[PDB]
Amino acid sequence: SNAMEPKVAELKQKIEDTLCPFGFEVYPFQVAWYNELLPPAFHLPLPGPTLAFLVLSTPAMFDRALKPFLQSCHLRMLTDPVDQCVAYHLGRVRESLPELQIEIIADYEVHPNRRPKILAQTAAHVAGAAYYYQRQDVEADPWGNQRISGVCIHPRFGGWFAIRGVVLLPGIEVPDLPPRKPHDCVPTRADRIALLEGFNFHWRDWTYRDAVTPQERYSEEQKAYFSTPPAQRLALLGL
């Protein structure tokens, strides 16, 4: 951007230049699209037309962001390698746009009462990043008295991705940002059932992530990383 009033496309380009080489994707949305669907308890306390960006990591993030980050780290200091790596790149967004007020909420942040600061999947949905498939998206479901948690599916990565956080730009208002529905890439009831069951009941076998066949998966190494318990992880990369 250069302008007296910065436009969404200029900002998106700048954030993408910063983040995309390192295996992230960014999707604009209005705060109102997020607040509309939510009770007052979960509302973001910003004007509705406030610009936000939903940020996710693709399979590439492991090799392009995390590995270089670990190599330049004092590994003894590190309690949360992935989170800190993502935090460093999110902080780089502030550096590329130093003139603008920016709030970042990461996916793992909670309020003192333990409620998530951002509902990542609702954000992913209204930003058109990934369709958020919920219990309500199955008519007359077979599941009875249990919690059926929802899951986002990306049209290119299927379930082989993660939502990393939201970048908010208070004072930049984009009331005419045109909304786009996420790709309904799991359209049939039978497939939504299999997807939700795979996510709620079988997530350790990975298979829910293939609910749409991906153009790219996590490598066998990245899979091994995330499925060995946190304490042994740096040993698995030989560090």
Ligand X SMILES: N[C@@H](CCC(=O)N[C@@H](CS)C(=O)NCC(=O)O)C(=O)O
Ligand Y SMILES: O=S(=O)(O)CCNc1ccccc1
Binding stretches for ligand X (CB under 6 A): 80-83, 162, 226, 230
- State the Cα–Cα distance between residues 143 and 133, nearest whole angstrom: 15
Q: Which of 73, 78, 106, 185 binds ligand Y (CB under 6 A)?
A: 106
Residue 179 vs 230, nearer CB to ligand X: 230
153 is in an annotated binding site: no
**Residue 173's closest CA among 85, 50, 90, 65?**
50
Asked if residue 120 belongs to a known ligand binding site, the reply is: yes
- Tell me which residue has tokens 């590439």: 60
Q: Which 35-94 residues touch ligand Y, going by CB under 6 A? A: 87, 90-91
Ranges within 131-160 binding ligand B12 (CB under 6 A): 132, 134, 149-152, 159
**Pick from 46, 54, 97, 118: which binds ligand B12 (CB under 6 A)?**
118
Cβ–Cβ under 8 Å, residues 59 and 222: yes
Question: Hey, what amino acid is at 1?
Answer: S
Instruction: Number of residues interacting with ligand Y: please give it, by CB under 6 A.
Output: 6
* Helices and strands, number each (H, E), in the chain: 9, 6
Question: Which positions from 21 to 40 touch ligand B12 by CB under 6 A, shown as an x/- string?
Answer: ----------------xxx-
Q: How far apart are CA 106 and CA 164, in angstroms?
A: 6
- Enumerate the β-bridge partners of residue 53: 28, 167
- Reduce the DSSP state of residue 188 to 3 states and report it: coil
Q: Give residues with Cβ within 8 angstroms of 61, minimum separation 6.
A: 22, 23, 24, 86
132 belongs to an annotated ligand binding site: yes
Which residues in this chain contact ligand B12 in the complex, by CB under 6 A?
A: 37-39, 42, 107, 116, 118-122, 125, 132, 134, 149-152, 159, 162-163, 199-200, 203
Binding-site residues from annotation for substrate: 107, 118-121, 132-134, 152, 163
Binding-site residues from annotation: 107, 118-121, 132-134, 152, 163
